[PDB]
Short mmCIF file of all heavy atoms in Angstrom, two decimals:
data_model
loop_
_atom_site.label_atom_id
_atom_site.label_comp_id
_atom_site.label_asym_id
_atom_site.label_seq_id
_atom_site.Cartn_x
_atom_site.Cartn_y
_atom_site.Cartn_z
N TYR A 1 -184.41 9.92 -65.20
CA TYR A 1 -184.93 9.89 -66.56
C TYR A 1 -184.18 10.89 -67.42
O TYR A 1 -183.60 11.86 -66.92
CB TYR A 1 -186.45 10.17 -66.59
CG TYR A 1 -186.87 11.57 -66.19
CD1 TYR A 1 -186.89 12.60 -67.12
CD2 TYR A 1 -187.26 11.85 -64.89
CE1 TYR A 1 -187.28 13.87 -66.76
CE2 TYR A 1 -187.66 13.12 -64.52
CZ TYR A 1 -187.67 14.13 -65.46
OH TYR A 1 -188.06 15.39 -65.10
N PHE A 2 -184.21 10.65 -68.73
CA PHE A 2 -183.55 11.51 -69.70
C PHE A 2 -184.16 11.27 -71.06
O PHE A 2 -184.39 10.11 -71.43
CB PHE A 2 -182.04 11.21 -69.73
CG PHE A 2 -181.24 12.19 -70.54
CD1 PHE A 2 -180.96 13.45 -70.05
CD2 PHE A 2 -180.76 11.84 -71.80
CE1 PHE A 2 -180.22 14.35 -70.79
CE2 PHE A 2 -180.02 12.74 -72.54
CZ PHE A 2 -179.75 13.99 -72.04
N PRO A 3 -184.44 12.33 -71.84
CA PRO A 3 -184.31 13.72 -71.41
C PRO A 3 -185.61 14.26 -70.83
O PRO A 3 -186.51 13.49 -70.51
CB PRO A 3 -183.95 14.44 -72.70
CG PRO A 3 -184.70 13.68 -73.75
CD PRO A 3 -184.79 12.24 -73.27
N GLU A 4 -185.68 15.58 -70.68
CA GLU A 4 -186.92 16.23 -70.31
C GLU A 4 -187.90 16.19 -71.48
O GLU A 4 -187.50 16.06 -72.63
CB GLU A 4 -186.64 17.68 -69.90
CG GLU A 4 -186.11 17.83 -68.49
CD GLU A 4 -187.21 18.06 -67.47
OE1 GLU A 4 -188.02 17.14 -67.26
OE2 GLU A 4 -187.26 19.17 -66.90
N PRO A 5 -189.21 16.32 -71.20
CA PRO A 5 -189.86 16.41 -69.89
C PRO A 5 -190.67 15.17 -69.51
O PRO A 5 -190.81 14.24 -70.31
CB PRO A 5 -190.79 17.60 -70.08
CG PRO A 5 -191.25 17.46 -71.52
CD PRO A 5 -190.16 16.69 -72.27
N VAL A 6 -191.20 15.16 -68.29
CA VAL A 6 -192.16 14.17 -67.84
C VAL A 6 -193.39 14.91 -67.33
O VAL A 6 -193.29 16.03 -66.82
CB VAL A 6 -191.60 13.24 -66.73
CG1 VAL A 6 -190.43 12.44 -67.26
CG2 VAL A 6 -191.19 14.04 -65.52
N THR A 7 -194.55 14.29 -67.50
CA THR A 7 -195.79 14.83 -66.97
C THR A 7 -196.34 13.90 -65.89
O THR A 7 -196.14 12.68 -65.94
CB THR A 7 -196.83 15.02 -68.08
OG1 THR A 7 -196.83 13.88 -68.94
CG2 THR A 7 -196.51 16.27 -68.90
N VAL A 8 -197.02 14.47 -64.90
CA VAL A 8 -197.54 13.72 -63.76
C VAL A 8 -198.99 14.11 -63.52
O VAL A 8 -199.30 15.30 -63.39
CB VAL A 8 -196.70 13.95 -62.49
CG1 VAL A 8 -197.21 13.07 -61.36
CG2 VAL A 8 -195.22 13.68 -62.75
N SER A 9 -199.86 13.12 -63.46
CA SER A 9 -201.25 13.30 -63.06
C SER A 9 -201.53 12.42 -61.85
O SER A 9 -200.77 11.51 -61.52
CB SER A 9 -202.21 12.95 -64.21
OG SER A 9 -202.44 11.56 -64.29
N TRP A 10 -202.66 12.67 -61.19
CA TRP A 10 -203.06 11.87 -60.04
C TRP A 10 -204.43 11.25 -60.31
O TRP A 10 -205.38 11.95 -60.68
CB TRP A 10 -203.07 12.70 -58.76
CG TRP A 10 -201.70 12.93 -58.22
CD1 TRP A 10 -200.89 14.00 -58.46
CD2 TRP A 10 -200.95 12.04 -57.38
NE1 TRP A 10 -199.69 13.85 -57.81
CE2 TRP A 10 -199.70 12.65 -57.14
CE3 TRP A 10 -201.21 10.80 -56.80
CZ2 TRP A 10 -198.72 12.07 -56.34
CZ3 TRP A 10 -200.24 10.22 -56.01
CH2 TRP A 10 -199.01 10.85 -55.79
N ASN A 11 -204.51 9.93 -60.11
CA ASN A 11 -205.70 9.13 -60.40
C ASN A 11 -206.23 9.41 -61.80
O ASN A 11 -207.44 9.52 -62.02
CB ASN A 11 -206.78 9.37 -59.35
CG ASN A 11 -206.28 9.11 -57.94
OD1 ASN A 11 -205.10 8.80 -57.73
ND2 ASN A 11 -207.16 9.26 -56.96
N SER A 12 -205.32 9.52 -62.77
CA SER A 12 -205.66 9.72 -64.18
C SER A 12 -206.49 10.98 -64.39
O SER A 12 -207.26 11.08 -65.35
CB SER A 12 -206.38 8.50 -64.76
OG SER A 12 -205.82 7.29 -64.27
N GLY A 13 -206.34 11.97 -63.50
CA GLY A 13 -207.10 13.20 -63.59
C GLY A 13 -208.25 13.34 -62.62
O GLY A 13 -208.91 14.39 -62.60
N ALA A 14 -208.54 12.31 -61.81
CA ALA A 14 -209.64 12.41 -60.85
C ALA A 14 -209.29 13.30 -59.66
O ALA A 14 -210.18 13.92 -59.07
CB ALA A 14 -210.05 11.02 -60.38
N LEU A 15 -208.01 13.36 -59.30
CA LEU A 15 -207.50 14.19 -58.21
C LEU A 15 -206.78 15.38 -58.83
O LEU A 15 -205.74 15.20 -59.48
CB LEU A 15 -206.57 13.37 -57.32
CG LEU A 15 -206.19 13.85 -55.92
CD1 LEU A 15 -207.43 14.09 -55.08
CD2 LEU A 15 -205.28 12.82 -55.26
N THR A 16 -207.32 16.59 -58.64
CA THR A 16 -206.78 17.68 -59.46
C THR A 16 -206.15 18.84 -58.70
O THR A 16 -205.06 19.28 -59.07
CB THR A 16 -207.90 18.25 -60.34
OG1 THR A 16 -208.94 18.79 -59.50
CG2 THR A 16 -208.49 17.19 -61.24
N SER A 17 -206.78 19.34 -57.63
CA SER A 17 -206.23 20.47 -56.90
C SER A 17 -205.61 20.00 -55.59
O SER A 17 -205.92 18.93 -55.05
CB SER A 17 -207.28 21.55 -56.66
OG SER A 17 -207.83 21.48 -55.36
N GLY A 18 -204.71 20.83 -55.07
CA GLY A 18 -203.81 20.41 -54.02
C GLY A 18 -202.70 19.49 -54.46
O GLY A 18 -201.98 18.96 -53.60
N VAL A 19 -202.54 19.28 -55.76
CA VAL A 19 -201.41 18.55 -56.32
C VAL A 19 -200.37 19.58 -56.72
O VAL A 19 -200.70 20.68 -57.19
CB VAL A 19 -201.82 17.66 -57.51
CG1 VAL A 19 -203.04 16.82 -57.16
CG2 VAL A 19 -202.04 18.48 -58.77
N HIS A 20 -199.10 19.25 -56.50
CA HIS A 20 -198.00 20.18 -56.74
C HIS A 20 -196.85 19.38 -57.32
O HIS A 20 -196.28 18.53 -56.63
CB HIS A 20 -197.59 20.90 -55.45
CG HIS A 20 -196.72 22.09 -55.67
ND1 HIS A 20 -195.62 22.07 -56.51
CD2 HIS A 20 -196.78 23.35 -55.16
CE1 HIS A 20 -195.04 23.26 -56.51
NE2 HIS A 20 -195.73 24.06 -55.70
N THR A 21 -196.54 19.62 -58.59
CA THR A 21 -195.45 18.95 -59.28
C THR A 21 -194.27 19.90 -59.37
O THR A 21 -194.37 20.96 -60.00
CB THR A 21 -195.89 18.49 -60.67
OG1 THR A 21 -197.12 17.76 -60.57
CG2 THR A 21 -194.83 17.59 -61.29
N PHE A 22 -193.17 19.54 -58.74
CA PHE A 22 -192.01 20.41 -58.65
C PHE A 22 -191.15 20.30 -59.90
O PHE A 22 -191.10 19.24 -60.54
CB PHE A 22 -191.17 20.05 -57.42
CG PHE A 22 -191.85 20.34 -56.12
CD1 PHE A 22 -192.78 19.46 -55.58
CD2 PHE A 22 -191.57 21.51 -55.42
CE1 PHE A 22 -193.40 19.73 -54.38
CE2 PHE A 22 -192.19 21.79 -54.22
CZ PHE A 22 -193.11 20.90 -53.70
N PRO A 23 -190.49 21.39 -60.29
CA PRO A 23 -189.53 21.30 -61.40
C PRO A 23 -188.43 20.30 -61.10
O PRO A 23 -188.05 20.07 -59.94
CB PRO A 23 -188.97 22.73 -61.49
CG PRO A 23 -190.03 23.59 -60.89
CD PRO A 23 -190.66 22.76 -59.80
N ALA A 24 -187.91 19.68 -62.16
CA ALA A 24 -186.92 18.63 -62.02
C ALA A 24 -185.55 19.20 -61.69
O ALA A 24 -185.22 20.33 -62.06
CB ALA A 24 -186.84 17.79 -63.30
N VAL A 25 -184.75 18.40 -60.99
CA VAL A 25 -183.33 18.69 -60.79
C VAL A 25 -182.54 17.91 -61.83
O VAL A 25 -182.93 16.81 -62.24
CB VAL A 25 -182.84 18.34 -59.36
CG1 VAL A 25 -183.85 18.78 -58.31
CG2 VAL A 25 -182.55 16.85 -59.22
N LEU A 26 -181.43 18.49 -62.26
CA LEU A 26 -180.49 17.81 -63.14
C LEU A 26 -179.34 17.31 -62.28
O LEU A 26 -178.56 18.11 -61.74
CB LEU A 26 -179.99 18.73 -64.25
CG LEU A 26 -179.53 18.09 -65.57
CD1 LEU A 26 -179.50 19.13 -66.68
CD2 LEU A 26 -178.16 17.44 -65.43
N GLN A 27 -179.24 15.99 -62.13
CA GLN A 27 -178.25 15.42 -61.23
C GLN A 27 -176.86 15.47 -61.86
O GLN A 27 -176.69 15.80 -63.03
CB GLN A 27 -178.62 13.98 -60.88
CG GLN A 27 -180.07 13.80 -60.44
CD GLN A 27 -180.33 12.41 -59.88
OE1 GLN A 27 -181.12 11.65 -60.43
NE2 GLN A 27 -179.65 12.07 -58.79
N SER A 28 -175.86 15.13 -61.05
CA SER A 28 -174.49 15.09 -61.54
C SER A 28 -174.30 14.06 -62.64
O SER A 28 -173.38 14.19 -63.45
CB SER A 28 -173.53 14.79 -60.38
OG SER A 28 -172.22 14.52 -60.85
N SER A 29 -175.17 13.05 -62.71
CA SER A 29 -175.09 12.00 -63.72
C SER A 29 -175.68 12.41 -65.06
O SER A 29 -175.65 11.61 -66.00
CB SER A 29 -175.81 10.75 -63.22
OG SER A 29 -177.15 11.04 -62.85
N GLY A 30 -176.22 13.63 -65.18
CA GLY A 30 -176.92 14.02 -66.38
C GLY A 30 -178.36 13.55 -66.47
O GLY A 30 -179.00 13.78 -67.50
N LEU A 31 -178.88 12.91 -65.42
CA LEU A 31 -180.26 12.45 -65.38
C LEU A 31 -181.11 13.40 -64.54
O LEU A 31 -180.61 14.10 -63.65
CB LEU A 31 -180.34 11.03 -64.82
CG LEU A 31 -179.62 9.94 -65.61
CD1 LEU A 31 -179.56 8.64 -64.81
CD2 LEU A 31 -180.30 9.70 -66.94
#
């Protein structure tokens, strides 16, 4: 995806803790 950022939820907010969204990597392709 391009550009930043993206947000991620689980079950539209029903699943909240124990979720871990990692920072994005910037690939060699610029994506």
